[PDB]
Amino acid sequence: RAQERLATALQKLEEAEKAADESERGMKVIENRAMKDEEKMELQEMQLKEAKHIA
Amino acid sequence: EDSDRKYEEVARKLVILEGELERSEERAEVAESKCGDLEEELKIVTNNLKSLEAQ
Structure with a gap:
């Protein structure tokens, strides 16, 4: 059960950080857009x- | 664009208004030349009629 909850931890952090990094590319593009709207x-x-x- | 075409239209109106007020004084002054020479010949013919009124 140690390695079972281990695998759960792995998949959880993996999906969660994929979500974090898609939000990160979202912030990239929105800061771009923000400077765009500014100019x-x-x-x-x-x-x-x-x-x-x-x- | 409103202010633009408005001023352009009224500027064309002004340029034609000038293109006519120019010869305004022209057809004014030719009238006066006519008045002058006509009064002159009036005097001439009034003198001549009187000179011929003799007998």
């Missing part, structure tokens, strides 16, 4: 600004 906001609020300027 988006910058440049598009800026074209709004120059729109008001020339308006």
